[PDB]
Amino acid sequence: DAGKSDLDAAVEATIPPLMKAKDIPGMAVAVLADGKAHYFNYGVASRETGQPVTQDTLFELGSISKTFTGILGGYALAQGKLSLADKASRYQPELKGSVFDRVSLLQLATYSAGGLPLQFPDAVAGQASMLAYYRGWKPDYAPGERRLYSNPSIGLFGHLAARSLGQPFDQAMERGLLPKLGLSHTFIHVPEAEQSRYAWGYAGVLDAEAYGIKSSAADLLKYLAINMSPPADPALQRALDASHAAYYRVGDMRQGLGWEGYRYPISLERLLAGNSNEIAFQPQKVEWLNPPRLAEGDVLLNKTGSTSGFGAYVLFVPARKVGIVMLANRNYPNAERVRAAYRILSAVDPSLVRR
Ligand SMILES: [Cl-]
């Protein structure tokens, strides 16, 4: 009962002040701890209608979509349909003859192919211009030398993973992986029957792979629970493990497939640094791990996600069986997401305040 009281106080001390400071219209917060889900809902899904936020309200997840894409790539790996060390052009003949004869799937997944940019140039408006862009791309760095956070990079990874499974990505995701995970309120395209619970935001080549998932706080908390306590299917267990593994380090940050991890307990300063614009928008030197590490020691895994009108954050700590979901319909600074989540996590885990 002491832990639940602490959790309640931490949410009350963090979320209302954040929403007031940043004029956030609505937030759904969900915390998993001690085997119980706790939901904290604030404000409105729409300023125009006054519809209240609930744990079933759908929000845009932005780049948290990249963690789903990483698990899909892990699933193709688990089924022997791809290998992370394979060259990208092996999975798309139209890429043969380009630099992607020399870039690995692992490099695409981890934004380290050689300087693929944050977003596609506007010259890319569909499949044919997308292929022409990749075929004509000239790297700024040798493969594996620098991390530059990139939608074209992990987007191509997800596209090729879907090809290895014999399906368009949207089909492999919405009609393959999400049903296998049991997520019935997680979507690339929000169906007509759920539009009434779809929040409004306040301020698309490979968009599904890179930023297109929508979900509720309840479904995303179930997703975190699945990431910590995997379902029975062995291919899914291996897919989840592959997405969580550490392939390289950037300082304290451990790059997975979509997921980003930290040895735990971790200080707030290091978690802020790892989620900073500096690390996102500048090329970073990395230290590759051989082999990749699925850590025995404690790890915290997280991901920020944003769109024009939405701001989301998730984190979980498998050893503690704690997950935190924060979904908002305004794109407010990532550092404030991390700070709030850290205060909530500190109230649930005494090993953290003790530092
Ligand atoms: Cl949609």
UniProtKB/TrEMBL annotation:
Q: Which reaction does it catalyse?
A: a beta-lactam + H2O = a substituted beta-amino acid
UniProt keyword list: Antibiotic resistance, Hydrolase, Signal
For this protein, the record's InterPro entries field holds: AmpC, AmpC-like, Beta-lactam-related, Beta-lactam/transpept-like, Beta-lactam_class-C_AS
One GO BP annotation of this record: response to antibiotic
Q: Which Pfam families match?
A: Beta-lactamase
Please, which domain of life does this record's source organism belong to? Answer: Bacteria
Q: Name one GO molecular function term.
A: beta-lactamase activity
GO CC list: outer membrane-bounded periplasmic space
Start and end of every Beta-lactamase-related domain? Answer: 12-348
Which Enzyme Commission numbers does its entry carry?
A: 3.5.2.6
UniProt-listed PANTHER family: BETA-LACTAMASE-RELATED, D-ALANYL-D-ALANINE-CARBOXYPEPTIDASE/ENDOPEPTIDASE AMPH
List the NCBIfam families hit by this protein, alphabetically. bla_class_C
- Per the similarity annotation, which family is this? Belongs to the class-C beta-lactamase family.
The protein depicted here goes by the name Beta-lactamase
Q: According to the entry, what is the taxonomic lineage of the organism? A: Bacteria, Pseudomonadati, Pseudomonadota, Betaproteobacteria, Neisseriales
